[PDB]
Design a binder for this molecule. Structure first.
Ligand code: ZN
Ligand code: ZN
Ligand code: ZN
Length: 89
């Protein structure tokens, strides 16, 4: 077999558990009007999968110092539809 060590690999994969990545200032936060339960359900850049949200109203935000957030990818009580983590691609 042959793997390339330079690749991002699987450092962002979180199969079976929630992502819970903490947003640092400047990073994008993704929210979907159709998929998210309340206006606090968010996805990180590594998780957000455009495929899941074709025809949906996606809202992007820049993370600030006042942003206290962790990624909700894989927490099934935060989403109306099952998501497909991008890190799995
Ligand atoms: Zn995430
Ligand atoms: Zn994910
Ligand atoms: Zn969506």
């Amino acid at each position: 077999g042959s793997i390339d060590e330079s690749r991002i690999g699987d450092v962002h994969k979180h199969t079976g558990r929630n992502c819970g990545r903490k947003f640092k200032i400047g990073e994008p936060l993704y929210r979907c009007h159709e998929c998210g339960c309340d206006d606090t359900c968010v996805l990180c850049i590594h998780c957000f999968n455009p495929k899941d949200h074709v025809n949906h109203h996606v809202c992007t935000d820049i993370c600030t110092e006042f942003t206290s957030g962790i990624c909700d990818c894989g927490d099934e009580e935060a989403w109306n539809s099952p998501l497909h983590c991008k890190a799995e691609e």
